[PDB]
Amino acid sequence: MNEFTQISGYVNAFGSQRGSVLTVKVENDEGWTLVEEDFDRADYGSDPEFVAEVSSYLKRNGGIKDLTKVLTR
């Protein structure tokens, strides 16, 4: 059911979907998932909210946009 899929436009972030709720993780160049979050759409009031908040969260948590930066805040 759950299947991590690499997110287009991030260093190595994967969004594994699991029945409405999405697992949005961020991996470094080291292949290590630096942080990982799960977001169920029942938390939000809209899908756009969700997709915005979701990819923006992993972004703010470790997801570097297409550029791949080994930084780690």
How was this structure determined? It was done by NMR
DSSP state of 42: G
Sign of torsion over alpha carbons 68, 58, 45, 47: positive
Q: What are phi and psi of 68, to 5 degrees?
A: 55, 90
Cβ neighbours of 26 (radius 10 Å):
24
Q: Give how far the C-alpha of residue 60 lies from the chain's centroid of Cα atoms, to the nearest Å.
A: 10
The answer to whether 42 touches 66, Cβ cutoff 8 Å, is no
What stretch of H or E contains 47?
helix 47-61
Give the residue carrying structure tokens 């292949």.
31
Domains parsed from the chain with CATH numbers: 1-73 (3.30.160.560)
Separation of alpha carbons 46 and 63, rounded Å? 23
Give the residue carrying structure tokens 């080291």.
30
